[PDB]
GROMACS .gro file of C-alpha atoms in nm:
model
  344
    1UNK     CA    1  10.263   1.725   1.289
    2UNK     CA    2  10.524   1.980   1.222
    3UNK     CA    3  10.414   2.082   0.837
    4UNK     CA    4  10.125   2.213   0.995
    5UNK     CA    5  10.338   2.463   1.206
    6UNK     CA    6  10.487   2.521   0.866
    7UNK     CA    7  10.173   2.615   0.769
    8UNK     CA    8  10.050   2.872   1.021
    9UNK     CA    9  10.452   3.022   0.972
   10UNK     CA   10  10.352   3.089   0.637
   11UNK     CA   11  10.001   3.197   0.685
   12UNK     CA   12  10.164   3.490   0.940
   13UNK     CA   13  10.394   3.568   0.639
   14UNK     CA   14  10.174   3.622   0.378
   15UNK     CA   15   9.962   3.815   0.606
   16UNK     CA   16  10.235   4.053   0.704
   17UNK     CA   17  10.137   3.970   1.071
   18UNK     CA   18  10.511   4.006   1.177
   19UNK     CA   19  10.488   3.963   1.552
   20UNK     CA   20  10.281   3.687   1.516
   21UNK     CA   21  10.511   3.571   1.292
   22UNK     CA   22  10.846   3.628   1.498
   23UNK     CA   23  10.660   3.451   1.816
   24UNK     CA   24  10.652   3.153   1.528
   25UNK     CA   25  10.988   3.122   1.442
   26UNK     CA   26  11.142   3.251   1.793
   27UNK     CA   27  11.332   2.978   2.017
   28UNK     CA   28  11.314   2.690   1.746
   29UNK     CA   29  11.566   2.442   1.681
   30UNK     CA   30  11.827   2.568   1.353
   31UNK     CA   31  11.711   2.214   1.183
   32UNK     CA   32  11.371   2.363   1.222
   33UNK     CA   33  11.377   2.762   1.138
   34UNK     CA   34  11.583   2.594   0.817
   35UNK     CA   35  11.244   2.322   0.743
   36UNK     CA   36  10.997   2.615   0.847
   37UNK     CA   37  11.089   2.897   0.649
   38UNK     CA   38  11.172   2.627   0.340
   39UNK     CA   39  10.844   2.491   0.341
   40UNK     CA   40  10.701   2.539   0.001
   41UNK     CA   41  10.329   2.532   0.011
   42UNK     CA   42  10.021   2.592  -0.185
   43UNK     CA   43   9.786   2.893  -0.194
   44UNK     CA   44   9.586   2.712  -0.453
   45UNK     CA   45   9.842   2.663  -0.751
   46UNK     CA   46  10.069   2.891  -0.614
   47UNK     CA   47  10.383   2.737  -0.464
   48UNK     CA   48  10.584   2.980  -0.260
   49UNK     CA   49  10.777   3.046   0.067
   50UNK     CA   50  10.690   3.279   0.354
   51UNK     CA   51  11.023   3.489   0.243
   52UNK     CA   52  10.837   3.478  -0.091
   53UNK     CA   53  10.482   3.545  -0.066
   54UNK     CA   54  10.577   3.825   0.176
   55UNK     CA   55  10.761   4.011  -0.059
   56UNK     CA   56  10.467   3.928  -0.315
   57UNK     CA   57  10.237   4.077  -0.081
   58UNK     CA   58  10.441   4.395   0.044
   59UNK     CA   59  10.489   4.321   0.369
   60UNK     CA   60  10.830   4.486   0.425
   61UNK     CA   61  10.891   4.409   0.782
   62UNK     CA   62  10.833   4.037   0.765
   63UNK     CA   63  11.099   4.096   0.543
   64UNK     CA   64  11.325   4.208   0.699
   65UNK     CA   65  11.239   3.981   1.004
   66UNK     CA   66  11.344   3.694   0.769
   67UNK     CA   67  11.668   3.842   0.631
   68UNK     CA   68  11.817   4.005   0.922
   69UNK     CA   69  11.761   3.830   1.177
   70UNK     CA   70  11.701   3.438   1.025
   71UNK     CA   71  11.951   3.464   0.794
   72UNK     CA   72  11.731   3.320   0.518
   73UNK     CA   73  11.856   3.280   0.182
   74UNK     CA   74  11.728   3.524  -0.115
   75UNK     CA   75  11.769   3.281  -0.434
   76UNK     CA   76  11.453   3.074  -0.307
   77UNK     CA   77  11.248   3.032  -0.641
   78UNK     CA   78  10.818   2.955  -0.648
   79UNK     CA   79  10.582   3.023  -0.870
   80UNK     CA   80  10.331   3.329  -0.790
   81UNK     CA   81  10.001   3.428  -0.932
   82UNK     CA   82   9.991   3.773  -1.105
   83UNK     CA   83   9.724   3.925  -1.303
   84UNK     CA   84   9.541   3.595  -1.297
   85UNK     CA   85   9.814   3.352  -1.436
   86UNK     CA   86  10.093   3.141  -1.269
   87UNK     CA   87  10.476   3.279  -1.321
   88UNK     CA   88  10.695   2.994  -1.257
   89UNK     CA   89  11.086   2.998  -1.115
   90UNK     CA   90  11.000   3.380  -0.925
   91UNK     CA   91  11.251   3.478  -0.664
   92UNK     CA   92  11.152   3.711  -0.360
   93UNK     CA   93  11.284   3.980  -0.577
   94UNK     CA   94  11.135   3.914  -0.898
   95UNK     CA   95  10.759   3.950  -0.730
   96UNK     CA   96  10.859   4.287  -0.523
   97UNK     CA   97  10.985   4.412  -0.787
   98UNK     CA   98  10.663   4.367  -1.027
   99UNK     CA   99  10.407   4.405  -0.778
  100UNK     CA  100  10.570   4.760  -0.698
  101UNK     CA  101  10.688   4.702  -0.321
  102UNK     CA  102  10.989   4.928  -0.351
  103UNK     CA  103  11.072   4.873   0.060
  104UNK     CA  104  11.125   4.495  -0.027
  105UNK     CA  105  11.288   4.557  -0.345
  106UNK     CA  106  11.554   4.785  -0.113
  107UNK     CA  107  11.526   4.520   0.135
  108UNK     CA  108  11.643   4.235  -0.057
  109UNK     CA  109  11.920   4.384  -0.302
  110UNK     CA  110  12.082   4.511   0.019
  111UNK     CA  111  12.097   4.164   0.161
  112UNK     CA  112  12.231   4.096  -0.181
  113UNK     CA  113  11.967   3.907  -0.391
  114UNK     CA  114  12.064   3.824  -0.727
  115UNK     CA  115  11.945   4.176  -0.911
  116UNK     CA  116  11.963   3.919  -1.249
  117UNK     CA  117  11.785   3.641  -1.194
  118UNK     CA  118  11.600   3.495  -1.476
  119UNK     CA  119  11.222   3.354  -1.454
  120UNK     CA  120  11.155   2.977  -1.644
  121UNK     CA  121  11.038   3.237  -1.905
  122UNK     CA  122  11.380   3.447  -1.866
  123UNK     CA  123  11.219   3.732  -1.717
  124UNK     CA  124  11.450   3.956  -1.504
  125UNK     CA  125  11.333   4.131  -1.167
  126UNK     CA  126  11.424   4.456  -1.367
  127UNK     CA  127  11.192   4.352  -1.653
  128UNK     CA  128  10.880   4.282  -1.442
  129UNK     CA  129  10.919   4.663  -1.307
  130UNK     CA  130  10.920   4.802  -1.661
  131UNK     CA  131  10.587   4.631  -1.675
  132UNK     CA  132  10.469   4.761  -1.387
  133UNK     CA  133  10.627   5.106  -1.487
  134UNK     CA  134  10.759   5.203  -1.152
  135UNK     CA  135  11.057   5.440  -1.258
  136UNK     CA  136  11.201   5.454  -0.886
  137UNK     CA  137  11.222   5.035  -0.869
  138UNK     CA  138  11.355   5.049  -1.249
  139UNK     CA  139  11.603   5.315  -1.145
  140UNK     CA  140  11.742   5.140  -0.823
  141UNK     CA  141  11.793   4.834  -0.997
  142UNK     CA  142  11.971   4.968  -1.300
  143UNK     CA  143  12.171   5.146  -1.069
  144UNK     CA  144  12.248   4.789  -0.861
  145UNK     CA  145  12.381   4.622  -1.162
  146UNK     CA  146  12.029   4.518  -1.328
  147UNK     CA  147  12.127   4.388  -1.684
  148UNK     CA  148  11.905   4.594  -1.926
  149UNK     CA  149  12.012   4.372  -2.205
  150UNK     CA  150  11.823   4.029  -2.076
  151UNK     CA  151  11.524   3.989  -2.265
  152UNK     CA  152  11.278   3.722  -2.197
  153UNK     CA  153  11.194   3.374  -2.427
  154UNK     CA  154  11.108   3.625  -2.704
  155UNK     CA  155  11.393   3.812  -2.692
  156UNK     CA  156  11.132   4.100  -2.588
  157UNK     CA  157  11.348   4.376  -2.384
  158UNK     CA  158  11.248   4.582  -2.140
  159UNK     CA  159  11.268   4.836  -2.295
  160UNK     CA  160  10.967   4.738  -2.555
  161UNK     CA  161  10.763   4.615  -2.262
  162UNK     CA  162  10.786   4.967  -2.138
  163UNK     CA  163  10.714   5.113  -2.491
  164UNK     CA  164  10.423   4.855  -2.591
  165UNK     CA  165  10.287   4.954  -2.178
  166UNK     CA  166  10.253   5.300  -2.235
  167UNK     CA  167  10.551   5.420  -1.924
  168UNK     CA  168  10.682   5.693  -2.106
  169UNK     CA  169  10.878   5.770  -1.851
  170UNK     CA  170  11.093   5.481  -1.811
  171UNK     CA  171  11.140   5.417  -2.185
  172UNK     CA  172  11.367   5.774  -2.109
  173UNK     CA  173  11.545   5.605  -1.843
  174UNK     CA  174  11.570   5.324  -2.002
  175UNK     CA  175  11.733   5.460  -2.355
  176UNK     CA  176  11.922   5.732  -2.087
  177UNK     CA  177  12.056   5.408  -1.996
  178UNK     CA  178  12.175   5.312  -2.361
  179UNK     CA  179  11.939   5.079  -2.412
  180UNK     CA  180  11.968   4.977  -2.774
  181UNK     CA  181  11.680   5.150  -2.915
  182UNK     CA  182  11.712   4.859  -3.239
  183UNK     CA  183  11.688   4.551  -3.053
  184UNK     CA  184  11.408   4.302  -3.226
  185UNK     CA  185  11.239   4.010  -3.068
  186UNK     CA  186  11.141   3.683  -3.227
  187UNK     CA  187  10.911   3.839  -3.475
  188UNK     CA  188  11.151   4.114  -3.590
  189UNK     CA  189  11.014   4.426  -3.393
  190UNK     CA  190  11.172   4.671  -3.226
  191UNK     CA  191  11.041   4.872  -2.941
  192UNK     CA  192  10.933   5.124  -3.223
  193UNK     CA  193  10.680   4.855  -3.347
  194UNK     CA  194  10.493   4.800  -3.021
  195UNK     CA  195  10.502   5.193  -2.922
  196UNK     CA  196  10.359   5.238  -3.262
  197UNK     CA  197  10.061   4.935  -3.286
  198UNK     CA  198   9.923   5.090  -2.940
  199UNK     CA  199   9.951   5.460  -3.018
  200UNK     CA  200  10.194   5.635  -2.779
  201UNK     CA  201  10.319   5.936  -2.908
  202UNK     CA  202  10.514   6.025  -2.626
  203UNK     CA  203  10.715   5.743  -2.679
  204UNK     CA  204  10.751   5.757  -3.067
  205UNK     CA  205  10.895   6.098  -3.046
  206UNK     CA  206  11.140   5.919  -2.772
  207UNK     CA  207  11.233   5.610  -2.933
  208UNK     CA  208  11.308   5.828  -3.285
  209UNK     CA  209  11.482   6.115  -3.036
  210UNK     CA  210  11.740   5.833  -2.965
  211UNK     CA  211  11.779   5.721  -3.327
  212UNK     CA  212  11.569   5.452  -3.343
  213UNK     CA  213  11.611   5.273  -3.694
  214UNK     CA  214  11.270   5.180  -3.892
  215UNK     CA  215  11.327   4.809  -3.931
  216UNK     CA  216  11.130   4.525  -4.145
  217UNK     CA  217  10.924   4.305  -3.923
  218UNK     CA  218  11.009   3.947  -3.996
  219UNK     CA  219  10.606   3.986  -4.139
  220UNK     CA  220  10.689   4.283  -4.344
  221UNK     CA  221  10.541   4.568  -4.136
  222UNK     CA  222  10.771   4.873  -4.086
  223UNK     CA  223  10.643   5.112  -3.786
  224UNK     CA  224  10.453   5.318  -4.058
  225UNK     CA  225  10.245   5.028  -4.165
  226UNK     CA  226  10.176   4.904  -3.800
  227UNK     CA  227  10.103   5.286  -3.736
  228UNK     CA  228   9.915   5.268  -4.056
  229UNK     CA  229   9.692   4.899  -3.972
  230UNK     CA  230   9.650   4.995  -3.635
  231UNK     CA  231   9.464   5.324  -3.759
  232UNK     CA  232   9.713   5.535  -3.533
  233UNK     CA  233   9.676   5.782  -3.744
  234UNK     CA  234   9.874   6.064  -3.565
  235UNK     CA  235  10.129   5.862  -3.512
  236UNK     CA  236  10.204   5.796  -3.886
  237UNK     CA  237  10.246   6.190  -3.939
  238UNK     CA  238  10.482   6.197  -3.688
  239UNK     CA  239  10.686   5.876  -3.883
  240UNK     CA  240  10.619   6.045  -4.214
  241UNK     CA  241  10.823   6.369  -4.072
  242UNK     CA  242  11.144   6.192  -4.090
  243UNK     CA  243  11.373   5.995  -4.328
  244UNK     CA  244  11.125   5.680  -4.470
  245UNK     CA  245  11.180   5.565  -4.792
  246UNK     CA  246  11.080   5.895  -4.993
  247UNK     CA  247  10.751   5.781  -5.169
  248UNK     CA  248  10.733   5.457  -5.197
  249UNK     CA  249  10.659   5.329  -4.851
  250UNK     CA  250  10.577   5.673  -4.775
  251UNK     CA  251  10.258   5.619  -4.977
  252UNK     CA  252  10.178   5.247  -4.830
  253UNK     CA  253  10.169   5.442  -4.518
  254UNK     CA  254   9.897   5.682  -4.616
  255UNK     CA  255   9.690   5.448  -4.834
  256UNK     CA  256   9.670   5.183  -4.535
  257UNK     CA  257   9.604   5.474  -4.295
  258UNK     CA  258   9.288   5.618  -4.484
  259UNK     CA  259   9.208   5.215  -4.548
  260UNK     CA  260   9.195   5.138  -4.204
  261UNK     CA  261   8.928   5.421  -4.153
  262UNK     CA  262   8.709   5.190  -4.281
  263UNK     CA  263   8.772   4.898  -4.166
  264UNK     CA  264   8.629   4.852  -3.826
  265UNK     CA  265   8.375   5.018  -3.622
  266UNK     CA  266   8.645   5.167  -3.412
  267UNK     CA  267   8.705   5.456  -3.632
  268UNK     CA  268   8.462   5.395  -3.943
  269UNK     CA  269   8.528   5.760  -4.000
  270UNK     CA  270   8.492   5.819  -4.429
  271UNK     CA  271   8.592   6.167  -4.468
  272UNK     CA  272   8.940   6.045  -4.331
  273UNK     CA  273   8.923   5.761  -4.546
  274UNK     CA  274   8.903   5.986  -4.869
  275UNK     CA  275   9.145   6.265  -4.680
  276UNK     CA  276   9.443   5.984  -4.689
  277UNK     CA  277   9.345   5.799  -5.001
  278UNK     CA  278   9.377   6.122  -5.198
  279UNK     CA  279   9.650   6.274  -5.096
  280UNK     CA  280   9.839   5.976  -5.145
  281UNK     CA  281   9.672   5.917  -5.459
  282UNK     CA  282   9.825   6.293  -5.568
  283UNK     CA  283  10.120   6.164  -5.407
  284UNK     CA  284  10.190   5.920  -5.663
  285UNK     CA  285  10.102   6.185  -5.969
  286UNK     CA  286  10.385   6.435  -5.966
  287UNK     CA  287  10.711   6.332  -6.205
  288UNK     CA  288  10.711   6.237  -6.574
  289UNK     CA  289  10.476   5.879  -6.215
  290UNK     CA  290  10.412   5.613  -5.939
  291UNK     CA  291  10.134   5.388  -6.094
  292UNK     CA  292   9.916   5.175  -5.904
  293UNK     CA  293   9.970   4.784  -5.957
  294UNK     CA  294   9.595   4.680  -5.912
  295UNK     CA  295   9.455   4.361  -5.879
  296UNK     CA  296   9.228   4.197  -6.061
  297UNK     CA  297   8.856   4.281  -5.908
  298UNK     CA  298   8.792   4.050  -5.639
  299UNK     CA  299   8.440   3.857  -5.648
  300UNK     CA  300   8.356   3.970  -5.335
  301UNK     CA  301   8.324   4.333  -5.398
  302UNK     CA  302   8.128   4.345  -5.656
  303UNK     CA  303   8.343   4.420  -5.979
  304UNK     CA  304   8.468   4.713  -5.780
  305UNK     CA  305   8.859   4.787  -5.863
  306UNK     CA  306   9.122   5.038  -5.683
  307UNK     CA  307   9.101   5.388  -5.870
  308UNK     CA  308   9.416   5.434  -6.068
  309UNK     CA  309   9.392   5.803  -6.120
  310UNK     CA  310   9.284   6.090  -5.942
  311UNK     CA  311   8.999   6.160  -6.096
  312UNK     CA  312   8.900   5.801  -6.061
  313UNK     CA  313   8.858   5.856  -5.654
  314UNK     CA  314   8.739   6.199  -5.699
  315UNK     CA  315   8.453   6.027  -5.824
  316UNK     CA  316   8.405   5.879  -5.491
  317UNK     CA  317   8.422   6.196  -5.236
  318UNK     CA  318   8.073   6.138  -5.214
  319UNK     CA  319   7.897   5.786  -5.220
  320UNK     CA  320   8.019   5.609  -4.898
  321UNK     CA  321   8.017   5.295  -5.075
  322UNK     CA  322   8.250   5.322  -5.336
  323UNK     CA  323   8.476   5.420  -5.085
  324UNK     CA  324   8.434   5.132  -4.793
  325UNK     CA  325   8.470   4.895  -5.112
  326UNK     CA  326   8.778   5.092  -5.160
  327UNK     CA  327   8.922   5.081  -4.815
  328UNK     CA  328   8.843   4.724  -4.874
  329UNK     CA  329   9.044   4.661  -5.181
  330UNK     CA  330   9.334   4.888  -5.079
  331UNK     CA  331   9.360   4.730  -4.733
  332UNK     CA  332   9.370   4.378  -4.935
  333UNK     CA  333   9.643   4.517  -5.201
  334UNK     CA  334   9.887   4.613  -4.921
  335UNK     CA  335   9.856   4.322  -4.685
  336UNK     CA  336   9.728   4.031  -4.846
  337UNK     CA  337   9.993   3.839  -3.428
  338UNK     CA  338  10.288   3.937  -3.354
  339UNK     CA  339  10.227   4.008  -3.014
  340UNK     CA  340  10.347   3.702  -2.812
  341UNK     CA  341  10.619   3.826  -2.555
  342UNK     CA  342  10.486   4.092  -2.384
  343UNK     CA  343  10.392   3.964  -2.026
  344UNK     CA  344  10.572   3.999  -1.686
   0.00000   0.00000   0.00000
């Protein structure tokens, strides 16, 4: 029985136990350190080798135990378990890289690991880093030749992983970089979109600092209105304070906003709800005119109907019904996910 050798090898490497390992592996036959440190087996449905669960698990000098000195190859592929799931086709490099092990990460570009290799899901060791939004792993790699352009199946860059994850930090280093601040996955969005659903300022001022265009989502949601749905609310000042389609849209944005105070328990907050309404409502009153297109009153609330003038939702400052009603109806006027790339 020589896979069961196999097996206590790769026990020793996932445990980082690297003198228990090297007694393993020292005065072996070259046919055999080859089938040993091969061996792919199973830590439940996780198929790796000791090179690879080792760097998964951070244990930098069985590392380097198997590069220097055993001359094993860095373009072995498994698939490892992070945050719960199974990632399929990960090098060595890939799971250092996300898991944050920046010793390993060092350790296997030197011995000159592909620094673009590409998960079954085309995920790039470079990407999984912006997810884990380690700036000094992002930083090495984009400095040894990491391609910030691959995106993953969803065309999803790594730069919007950064921006939907909240690293502010390496969304600068990333656009520093010249990342294209307009790339769009799948759906349509752009790194703006994702920044903006989730509510990081930070990165909103970044993303418009470096000229970031508001784009159509395939769905029809600009930034504002995902700012807007998502009940961001100081985000959409901060879109409102630059060039966005002068009233038009700029209105959709506030009306949604103040709508979206009323939808959910999450903000439920009514005084907002009136604060937006209205000022968009005076918004639309000041030429000689931006009148509402209302729809018919919808059976379910009521008769109720969107107020058309001013004076119409002045009416309503008071009587917190007429006005969840009307979040309710002006929600429904404007809109009637996209959230599918954004793993490792």
């Amino acid at each position: 029985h020589m896979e069961g050798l196999a097996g206590y090898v790769y026990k020793a490497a996932s445990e980082g136990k690297v003198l228990t390992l090297a007694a393993l592996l020292l005065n072996r036959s070259e046919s055999d350190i080859r089938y040993l440190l091969g061996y792919v087996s199973q830590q439940g449905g996780q198929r790796s080798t000791p090179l690879i669960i080792a760097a998964r698990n951070g244990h930098a000098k069985v590392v380097r135990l198997l590069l220097e000195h055993y001359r094993v190859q860095t373009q072995q592929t498994g698939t490892v378990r992070f945050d719960g799931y199974v990632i399929d086709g990960a090098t060595a490099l890939w799971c250092a890289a996300g898991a944050g092990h920046f010793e390993v990460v060092k350790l296997l570009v030197s011995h000159g690991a592909n620094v673009n290799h590409t998960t079954v899901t085309n995920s790039t060791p470079l990407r999984a880093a912006c997810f884990d939004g380690r700036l000094d792993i992002v930083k090495y790699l984009v400095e040894n030749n990491a391609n910030i352009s691959i995106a993953n199946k969803y065309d999803n860059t790594c730069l919007m992983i950064a921006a939907y994850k909240g690293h502010t930090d390496v969304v600068r280093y990333l656009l520093e970089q010249r990342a294209d601040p307009n790339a769009k996955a799948h759906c349509g969005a752009t790194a703006l979109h994702f920044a903006a659903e989730a509510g990081h300022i930070d990165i909103v001022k970044e993303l418009i600092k470096w000229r970031a265009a508001i784009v159509v989502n395939g769905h029809g949601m600009t930034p504002l209105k995902v700012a807007a749905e998502s009940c961001k609310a100081d985000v959409v000042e901060l879109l409102l304070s630059h060039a966005d389609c002068d009233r038009r849209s700029r209105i959709e944005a506030l009306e949604l906003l103040g709508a979206s105070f009323a939808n959910d328990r999450e903000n439920y907050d009514i005084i907002k709800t009136y604060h937006y309404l209205y000022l968009a409502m005076l918004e639309r009153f000041q030429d000689g005119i931006l009148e509402k297109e209302v729809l018919p009153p919808i059976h379910a609330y009521g008769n109720r109907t969107e107020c058309r003038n001013p004076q119409e939702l002045e009416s309503i400052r008071q009587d917190r019904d007429a006005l969840h009603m009307e979040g309710l109806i002006v929600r429904e006027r404007i809109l009637g996910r996209l959230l599918l790339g954004l793993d490792r």
